[PDB]
Amino acid sequence: GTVNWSVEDIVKGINSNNLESQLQATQAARKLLSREKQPPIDNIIRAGLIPKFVSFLGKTDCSPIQFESAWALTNIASGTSEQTKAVVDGGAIPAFISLLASPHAHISEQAVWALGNIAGDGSAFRDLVIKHGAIDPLLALLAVPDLSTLACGYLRNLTWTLSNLCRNKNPAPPLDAVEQILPTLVRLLHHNDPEVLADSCWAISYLTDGPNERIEMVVKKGVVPQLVKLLGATELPIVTPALRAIGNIVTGTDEQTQKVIDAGALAVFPSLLTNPKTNIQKEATWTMSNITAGRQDQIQQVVNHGLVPFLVGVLSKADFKTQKEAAWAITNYTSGGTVEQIVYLVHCGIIEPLMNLLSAKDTKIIQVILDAISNIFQAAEKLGETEKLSIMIEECGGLDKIEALQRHENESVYKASLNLIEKYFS
């Protein structure tokens, strides 16, 4: 029927003066654009069909052509930034926003999807969708007593589009829009569908990727406990965005980090720091490094949860990037920690793996490590135990590596190594 038309047949049908023929040709276009392999997006655009589709969006008396044109434009807008720009230039934004109030659920959903792609293109189109007033009707679609009464796919598409309205930076979304969206986002963050939860955590992670004021906008809504709960979920698509959100939050002030700690987040990190997925381990170690860079009572919270041995483990064996985040965590620990806490750090066996990591080719990890060593040596000086530490470093081959780093081409590297040698290995 409408399977595998040519673009010229589609153009001939859409340019006819017969609404029904236009509907058939539009459906044919939709089917061309929804095939598995290589849809002819550029050919459809070059045929000049976008304005016709946009005009079909407004044909209230023929909802089928509204749906087919909405679907076709959706799939065009799903492509490159140039194709999405083609959809926007046709005036599609206000038309889709108008369709958000359609009495037909599938048409309204299709509009939600299209706006999701357009806004998902980038900060500019995101802000333009917002300027046309999409947030009010979008959120109105979710103003029901119980989200479970909505269709699963409907709710999933709404959540996804909203998450795209929270996505991208330079600039971040307008503050007023984020405040307008955040309550519904909190509501979705408590829904029982895994995809709604994943997309909600992603949206929160977007909103927390920024200055402390944005982080505060999120944290003030009281979502941290829920974020920890989801951090303990079994579905990796949930744990990943939840962990990213937590990390972002702990990049903020010590009080926000403290709200993460009070929610019980640390209790989850024994598993996260041994998670079989590399990215979970890396992001968890990065989060930890942003915790050990905080107050001494917070470092002490890290200690009490038994997470220092897990850091020693990651530093001993893990993907190199995860090991680098571990080195950062150690250097922050030693920078802000007390003498007792640094002593405890050595008692857990940090020295040997820390030394082994000096044979890495990455310059910055060598710098980080040498700073950590400097700090530990400072604690030893404050305890008069520097000799024993020098012996520790010498028995595991660390002294050889430092002495060799004296010949390292980087300035700060061979500076720090020279200082360590002449000050503690004479």
Binding site: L33, S34, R35, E36, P39, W71, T74, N75, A77, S78, G79, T84, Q110, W113, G116, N117, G120, D121, W160, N164, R167
Partner: peptide, 8 residues
Amino acid sequence: FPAKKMKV
């Protein structure tokens, strides 16, 4: 991960 979805 990509932010756009093609409806197949």
